[model samples]
Target: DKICLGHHAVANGTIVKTLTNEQEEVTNATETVESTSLDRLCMKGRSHKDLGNCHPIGMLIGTPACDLHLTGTWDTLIERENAIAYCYPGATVNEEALRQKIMESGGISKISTGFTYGSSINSAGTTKACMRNGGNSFYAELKWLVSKSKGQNFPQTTNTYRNTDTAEHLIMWGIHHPSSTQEKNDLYGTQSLSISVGSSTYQSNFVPVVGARPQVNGQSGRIDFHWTLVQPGDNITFSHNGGLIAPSRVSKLIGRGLGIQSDAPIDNNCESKCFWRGGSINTRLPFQNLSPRTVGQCPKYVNKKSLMLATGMRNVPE
Candidate 1:
């Protein structure tokens, strides 16, 4: 019942290329940073001083920027040829007329009911449509996908067994069974779900490993989150490193989703942007601008004795 909701390569397979280096050097004109120091912060910020006391010594390692694309496969069972076979078992099926009928019918699943079957046991006696017995709901979903396209023709590409719009519609359904040899044609290939950005459409190609087997532990229909089909803009926001930062303006567009803030810092010219007071001396004190790294690693200190007690040491008198 579960479906995979992501982009997948139909014929060419997935293509992933590194757009930018994963890590980079944090260079500073005046200060000498220690490479071995673990106290420094590597996240994007206004200035080096805001990160921590650690100077800019060497490369500040970060996740790489990757560009990916996933082409989608066809919904084979409902394809023109397959549908004709399923609808009319022995009649001479006209491939071109079937295709035209499918397009004219708006890819209606019930259109199969109109065809005459030749088989005795599987003959369409009382059945109104192919897949009509128990697949009506599934067909409805497919119909929705066709409607979503709004009559736009799919981008044509070589090696595609199905039309672009048909593939896109199946992908939007977000279900597949690639591991099932029993239902090979029905579930062998991958499907993709995508969103549009302006005139161009982008799909998700977020596989943990590129070119690996589609199924994990014999399960199929896995979803990836690597590349989004939407355009990057200021309206988008996501959580990262315990701080709510906007990544739309960042130089590295890819890294923004992974807690990468913009390099620009808040100007001190305004009252809100300026920090009138310095950080607390102990850093553990309240009402301080705590670094994200410190917050993640450092323990809460109610008092000196409490801090020692929490660290598995015997509490000493203050």
Candidate 2:
């Protein structure tokens, strides 16, 4: 009857600590930021300007610079009509690989299939749209975070998660609108399909040691954005403020299929999809850049040949 066992401290619970003057200052500041604000633009984007100094303010905030990478293959089964079509962001085709595979399979093309950029997406134009859109796509977006390091203090290393002590690296993917205005008409009665692949592998090489305060108590342990495995068939939903596509239905629109520019400004309460004017400058727009905010106006897309890339995120193993 004398055996002793270690266990969670039952007596450990909330004991209110009075706010010191310094603590009161910080508390008031946080409350002011949380309660009332005029200026919306924080270091991040616009929609989340209210939560000043909390963490990343807007969609896809605090994302460290990363080397963008992509790879995929698809074929349109052109049975009788002239041809079939497909597209993605930035991809250089493997022509020799394509030829050899076709030859081996005894597949015949009256006219050998030639590759096109599918959608008229250009890097410059697309970047401008995203910057102007001001945080629409929320796939693979960080669910938890605090602070990120900057300048010389930031660890000069690749594959390491940013602010590992406070936050985790994350990968995001979704079908974005094409940058071109002309290409918008090309979707007449037909849909452009896509497939994307990316990972949130932290590489686990080095981790930064820093102080972090969790927004809520009891879940303060460090987190790894790099999941052990990204199993196929995992349920996922794409969204800005609401669901874009259910995971099960995503495949029906991939590879030799349809559904182009269907999820723009993907919020439930939106007037219409806005265009990126001039398609340059990472700045949002006329109202977005002004001190006193204006309403119902933004940049416009310059060309009509811009393309949208479809991407998917899979958890990477350690």
Candidate 3:
């Protein structure tokens, strides 16, 4: 099947415009970079750079989790009204309360159970939770989503009516880096994405796409990614040029999780700032001190980590 481009810069439906972009803070930082040609050995620190970007690009280092105040559009409003309505069929609808609940608890389900259908829709204890006493037919299919969100295994349960219609399903993803030195959100000097769906442990078709940079529309940082909430047989994929994960590390991500890096580069002085290296500055390299373009502003690289933390479903440290 053709890969699902999801909603690109183009709003394919109500979903992308409403929830996704609100969380994305990508800018083509590489555009602001003075030069791409790597030349001499330079300190990779954010505060130190010799103005020509002739140094090794610094790696993104900071908090991995974050909480974000995502914007709620009219489309989100619509989804909220219907969210779990059938599951909590007998419960009363409190629009404002639900909205606040979403905002107040913004982290990616840090509680005992994440995004579980078990959360009480209302304040009172009497109201049975959504996942507890379910309602309509579609509710069964939601189990896969619920289980996966809690960082739990995908439930085996399936529904008879598969892939009929779709709903606006919004999900905030989290990332975990296992290593400090070698593992990084920003691979090389650009952003990358690695993700998959389904029980990869069970199906041969469930391969995760790795090293996907933001498929920019015209320039870098213009994000283009998508997927549909549908039923069986459709091997819907997120569009990326990275192909599938190599056989070497396929097991690393298989049945493991979704991973995303920011589209913003190491936006910092490391690329623009120029220190006069005592004139022994390797004259062979493109060593220019304080170019006119390094004029207006200096930048931050850790914010790439901050952006990941905030959007990866944890409150970015204040």
- The model with the greatest lDDT is 3
Cα deviation in Å at residue 60, candidate 2? Answer: 2.3
Residues 1-318 of candidate 3 have per-residue lDDT tens digits of 687653223212111111446543321111222223223222333222121211000000001110111111110100111122222211112434433333222122111111222231111211122223253121211221222122232223221212222321222111222122222322211234333433212221222223424322221121111212223333222222111111100000001111111112233233322222121112222223323222112232121211221212222222
> For model 3, what is the error of residue 23's alpha carbon versus the real structure, in angstroms, after optimal superposition?
57
Which pairs clash in model 3? 6-226, 51-273, 66-309, 66-314, 66-315, 67-314, 67-315, 67-316
lDDT at position 249, candidate 1: 14
TM per candidate comes to 0.18, 0.17, 0.15
lDDT of 3 at 32: 22
lDDT of 2 by residue, 9-127 (tens): 22222222233422111111111011112221111211211111211111122221110101112221101111111111221124334322321221111111111111221111212
Q: RMSD per prediction, one decimal?
A: 28.5, 30.8, 29.2
The global Cα lDDT (0 to 1) of model 3 is 0.21
Worst 10 residues of 2 by lDDT: 242-251
Candidate with more favorable, higher lDDT: 1 or 2: 2
